[PDB]
Design a protein around this ligand. Structure first.
Ligand SMILES: NC(=O)c1ccc[n+]([C@@H]2O[C@H](COP(=O)([O-])OP(=O)(O)OC[C@H]3O[C@@H](n4cnc5c(N)ncnc54)[C@H](O)[C@@H]3O)[C@@H](O)[C@H]2O)c1
Ligand SMILES: O=C(O)Cc1c[nH]c2ccccc12
Lengths: 495, 495, 495, 495
């Protein structure tokens, strides 16, 4: 097991690829322009990364289209596509230490989380999806004797995947697994705040046996190459994970261009509801702190609204404060660190401004509240809790995307539900109770794509993930994710 | 069996309802404004129809939301929702002669078509969807022993349904069947060119046992109340059938407002491919004629591009011409009529303009081409055929929505396929051949939501219907239509 | 609502059909022999019923086979089979009062039960199964590009259905619904203790539109015509509901003859587990009473072993005793009667013998225990409860098929589970607790086809029903029942 | 690539395990008895193999039951069971040369077939089944709001698997893949004619991580240990592949014992129908010879009845004779050999007696017909063809299970179908035609579990495999195979 000194040495000894990847080769952007990739660990320069624009989008899509039409991947036998996807996952695992390190340096998450959660999470999405390919069956309708009615699925063609910076590799693999498994060509567009792991795995895909042109990667800004992909007249489908504001813009771009399918995973303000009869309050307290502090609270399913039944509030909140105290910001390259840096200065100032807004709107600070470790040249903030929060407060309505907890109380189940659903969002929610009826009925009443009962952040590759309402449309993970990347065809044959 | 004079007497003796329907009662628009509903049959005033606007959209959505939240329909037992939907369908059939007559007077299709195709088709959509409700099963995931993972579907809430004028009742039922069966409230927005049947069935829904508020109907213009529904912040989903131009605008509206789900059924330029080894050339000829002339060519899946293998072209085209000659425009109230009036003067002008464009671009007129029966005060055009059409010509690229057939030739299956897919559309296609491999391989290669083999206009309620590319997203009919009206939820329970 | 005197008048005025039914016509047995059908209500002669034997089995199977091969029903369009099955169900409901009366006179269950439970239950099985037919889809495999792999289901052909006397019409419909819906011909063999309703509905099937030969009915003894069907070389499948002893014999018959498929629904000794934290003890008490007394305890899933946590036993048992006191034997033709006659003298003797065995083995009689109403000429027994029962006792191990309840105690959930599964049977079980984990984990641990939580006798047509272990194989109701009446075919086509 | 000399050296250098395997250890039979395992290659003694009896069955089942109840495998997380099954498959491949060699020496098939078909076939069944585990979902019924209806699958418990000698390892894996993947304990009972690969892989299962007791292997005779497993009162399910005669006996044993579920894969007499319009007659001829000569015609789907349209018979039969001539018996340890030895003297004399019966009943010998290579001390027979066969002849009705072809003619499709279905069997069939309608309609009319079109022996792990009629019940391969090893449970929860 590697030490802090080992990781620091490894970080120094990396050679970091920064180019885009098109038709099987790394390449500069057509303009030759780059942007600086800066580490939030200490501010070091990782790489000059290709800054792609519309011209590069055009070339990547021409490459994607041509590869799709050749059938090299899109008409490869299901069992061979499975084998290739599983080897692709295997190469992520074989290169886990470098990939984990890139992620940590790129966007600041703890090396033990990169290594233990992100890389295996990414590989598992690729291999599970690959495993599923020949387990899927299409349909034959019940028809008259002189008819054969087939209902089958086909790949849409060229897929644009636009992804965010909080789980760069894993979110990429959530798209890539099903999109590639179904036979599509994909143009992947990583966040400008974390381009490095996407750039790196382009090569691994080739090594696994993914044909040239099937997976192209275009680093660069959202408002340049990202927008260009979303407006492209020969992209069939765009899948997106990011902010709600940009998600809406993609719908507009699709309407302005070619009516491409649009699938969105956006923000969240997930309610974590703890009833007095929770089976294990200590477990509920640990999970409540984890739900907001893990990955610096840069998690769209962060349990950012803690709803607690009033009769246990006085006992429970100290338990949460105590639990939160074990999550301490520190050097991300130290294996012992469990909370890392925020992704950048812009992100940190947003979080600090929301903390200020907590004070302004009348909430009570009971833990954290300040920036720390300024001397490192990195960006760190204490996990923070506000008590006495009303659901109309800004820190209650708006996604903060930092480790900032809002605590709300209720006295009836019906009120807990009303408060929990009082949001434009609907990504996730949790319910803690030992009562059979109350568990299922409350879960059923919550308008969220994921509802966790007596746990937080549950589910694995078998569990569809995505939003109600303005948290998005469609689902990642499970077999349901495949439907985003395919079209139904009814073939009706007269005999 | 009713005669022409019987239908004319019945037409005279109708009292026609023109009001909007909200919260279980017919009502004027808030503004008190109306528009004239004029028959294309002869020009008579059918009714002064409520002209709804944004205020009416607001009242109908508030009514829809409150109905949804009460659980009166959305939490009604599956078997009870089933029985109600089947009674709803039964009422359409019980009132078939009136509904068919309203349809024929409202938009000009022949009375024998309204009675024999539209009303039964609409009823079938309502009853089949109802029958299916308690035959559907959600999912339980394979999880560790201390987890229970449920994957269930829930109604989205408030659905706006915006539909066109070519099959007014049937297209509304395609939406209502699954949207209502899943428990949603629906605000239905019929075309301003054909509001009457939607207005009428609002009352039948109440009689069937659909609760007040669950089905509201808002006649009025697209750019007023239609746009208001698409922009409404408390509408969860909009489903649409209409032009590609407006479909795109709906995506824009959703992005501008609340990221509502958008499901689109749009235009088409469907290729009908006849190979030299078609098993029954006469059947192929009869079908080719019917595919362009049925419902005055005002059919989204009209076989408007006829692709013929060159070696049989000289024999096959005269057969198509003779078959088309049996399709003759006439009085829509005559039961013997198989081709009715176009919907309005604007539509006839569009069709005549495209006929002129056919001449212009260099095609050869071989049948029809003229307006007829002007003295009736109605709008009628001869079923028309252009020979020597190249796929680049305007009449081959652009949807005409009239009875105008373009005839193209090819020499290889590969060429046939290239021409078929050379279109922004992808709603339907057909292939005629006796050969096993050629049938399946050609069908597989065609980028269209429905592919019919050795028949045209096939499929029933078991066949999903909808577009590739700019012909839309999502499917109507079958069990797959239900997915447009529900959300997935993953409930992961720790035990 | 009909009174007792109304029902008695109607009973007097029935003309009762006693013949077999083959190839669309009622018929005598080949031998001309009959058996007396005697009512347990008072002892009157209902009819002289045809006593079929091997020759009749042969004629009915030849008729079934020829009907099957003609395609008149087996190749009838799915939507047409659906409509016919729904009309068939409609005729049962249209003739509900006669059918219910036949059932009550034939085997002694209360008229309000026959009318309120059996006839609607039977109709529901026929209509739900019919509704499902065109909602089912077969499969298309994920194959290489030059292969098309179809996985479809086909009717087995000729089905023999052998059913018991406790729910004569309902058990027949459980078989007929799915067997007929899938296109099979059926030879139905009702119990010699209750042949009348099966004989009657043969005619209703013809009226609904079921073709001649598709449903044949052969009244007669198990060891004659029953055995002949099970041994017949041209019967493809036998489905059975009855005793475990005979179920086993059927497997032997199939091995001795033609390896026909054998699907069995056999006996049970279902445990009803009441934990101290049941949410509603009164509901639990009412249900415990109903679970043993309903239909005279002649119910395969009768909750005949009541397992009670020792800490609530002293409070709960008197509640069960009081609840059981509302269940009182009486004249089956009185609509107020909730407990009817046992089916015959032989059955009453068996029940009395088990009551005596209860005393013998050392249990404590706390309610009932005696035959009553002897002066009526009918066979009636008091609903009975033994306390202090050990699971090794005869009344705890052996199915009694009378209203005799055994009460056992436990201290831990683990012990409850061990006792519940300590049986050769596995048809049903129930668990009563308010606790989430205990509910699901206990339910998961119980080896039984149906597990009911905080209710007894739950489920509807959506719930598969059938046994673990010696309680049978395969399931009735739901879509899973269809699989007993079809075969899978893999059609792999090279293109 | 290994030479004949290499394989002969390897064969000499094997140390061959002969013991049974129970609770994680190799063991003698309780009696200490053995039987000689003799190679049909040249007659050498491979090993003295444990001859188990009823006492060993008892001990293996006690071990199986105890392992199942411990939950070590039966309650292991789905994703971990998947991993273990995939490693199990991997160890088959890692030990492929030894396993292939054992199979070839044990029952005489060519080493290139053992290595190229059997071992990879076996591994693929284990890994595909393992891959499928967490891709399967159970069901949630549509129920009223106060109900939650779960329909789930659970492992049956202890499975006996009894397998034949023609594909010893592969047939074993067809059972083991799904049975183990679903969580059952399995007692595997290999043929006495080929025990060695089953004995050997018991150890590999342990190495892969299958817990002790989950997979026990009992070599020995059918009429001793095989019968004992089938009659055992604590075996829940027996799955069988073998002769039709013994398959029927298993049904009888189940009836005599505990009503255990019985799933059967038995014999076949598969029709290979070649129409005059077959797309590629040469391909049809090659496949027809392969269909009967591959694995010495010891294949239950052997195309043993060749049905040829009369108009091509004179051209086609010489093509078949010529093709068959390239299949030549030779030394099984020679990599060039494509037809090996028959399994033993008993089998060879059966085949020779059927060839004699071909002459007797009036058929015309047009190829092969004799035993050869007597000097080797092994058993070999020429691939043989009889012409002018009528379907009532013994060689037409009875499974021969040697390389003996019967040629029949027809002149209409309807006659081809009648002849093809004129059999007690229904395992497989094939159809060769270029015509779309004739292909699908003929395929639909054939009463066989597998129908191959324009190919023979098609399908992969996605295609269910098994019989109609006396060819068996249930299916191996695909997801459908899992249903043989699980029980449905309806858990109905009142909320
Ligand atoms: N599964 C999920 O739903 C999920 C997962 C992780 C994060 N999120 C959300 O993502 C957000 C993370 O912050 P963020 O800054 O990465 O979101 P963001 O919307 O600012 O950027 C996300 C991606 O979209 C690109 N983009 C930006 N503008 C674009 C434009 N006009 N056109 C096309 N592409 C454009 C960006 O370059 C980036 O790749 C959070 O709100 C979080 O809730 C959601
Ligand atoms: O979508 C339409 O244009 C209506 C439509 C498509 N297929 C049909 C078959 C019969 C009647 C109407 C339609």
């Amino acid at each position: 097991t590697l030490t802090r000194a080992d990781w620091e040495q490894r970080a120094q000894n990396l050679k970091i690829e920064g180019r885009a990847f098109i038709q099987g080769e790394y390449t500069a952007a057509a303009s030759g322009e780059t942007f600086d990739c800066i580490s939030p660990v200490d501010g070091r320069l990782l790489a000059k990364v290709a800054s792609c624009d519309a011209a590069d989008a055009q070339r990547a899509v021409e490459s994607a289209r041509s590869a799709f039409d050749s059938g090299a991947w899109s008409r490869l036998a299901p069992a061979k596509r499975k084998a290739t996807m599983i080897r692709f996952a295997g190469l992520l695992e074989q290169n886990a230490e470098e990939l984990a390190l890139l992620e940590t340096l790129d966007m600041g998450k703890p090396i033990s989380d990169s290594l233990g959660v992100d890389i295996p999470g990414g590989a598992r999405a690729l291999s599970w999806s690959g495993e599923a390919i020949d387990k899927l069956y299409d349909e034959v309708a019940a028809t008259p004797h002189d008819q054969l009615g087939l209902v089958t699925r086909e790949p849409v063609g060229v897929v644009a995947a636009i992804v965010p910076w909080n789980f760069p590799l894993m979110m990429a693999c959530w798209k890539l697994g099903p999109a590639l498994s179904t036979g599509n060509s994909v143009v992947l567009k990583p966040s400008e705040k974390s381009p490095l792991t996407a750039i790196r795995i382009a090569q691994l895909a080739i090594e696994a046996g993914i044909p040239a042109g099937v997976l192209n990667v275009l680093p660069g800004y959202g408002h340049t190459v990202g927008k260009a992909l979303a407006l492209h007249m020969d992209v069939d489908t765009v899948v997106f994970t990011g902010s709600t504001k940009i998600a809406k813009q993609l719908m507009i771009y699709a309407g302005e261009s070619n009516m491409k399918r649009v699938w969105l995973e956006a923000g969240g303000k997930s309610p974590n509801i703890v009833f007095a009869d929770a089976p294990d309050l200590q477990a509920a307290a640990d999970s409540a702190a984890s739900a907001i502090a893990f990955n610096q609270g840069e998690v769209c399913t962060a349990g950012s609204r803690l709803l607690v039944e009033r009769s246990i509030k006085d006992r429970f909140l100290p338990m949460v404060i105590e639990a939160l105290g074990t999550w301490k910001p520190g050097n991300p390259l130290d294996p012992a660190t469990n909370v890392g840096a925020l992704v950048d200065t812009q992100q940190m100032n947003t979080v600090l401004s929301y903390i200020a807004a907590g004070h302004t709107d009348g909430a009570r600070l009971v833990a954290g509240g300040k920036q720390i470790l300024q001397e490192t040249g990195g960006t760190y903030v204490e996990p923070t809790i506000f008590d006495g929060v009303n659901n109309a407060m800004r820190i209650a309505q708006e996604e903060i995307f930092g480790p900032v907890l809002s605590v709300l109380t209720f006295d009836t189940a019906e009120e807990a539900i009303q408060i929990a659903n009082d949001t434009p969002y609907g990504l996730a929610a949790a319910v803690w109770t030992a009562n059979l009826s109350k568990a299922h009925l409350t879960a059923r009443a919550l308008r969220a794509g994921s509802v966790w009962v007596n746990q937080y952040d549950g589910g694995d590759m078998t569990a569809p993930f995505g939003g109600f309402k303005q948290s998005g449309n469609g689902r990642d993970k499970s077999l349901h994710a495949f439907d985003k990347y395919t079209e139904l065809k009814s073939t009706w044959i007269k005999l």
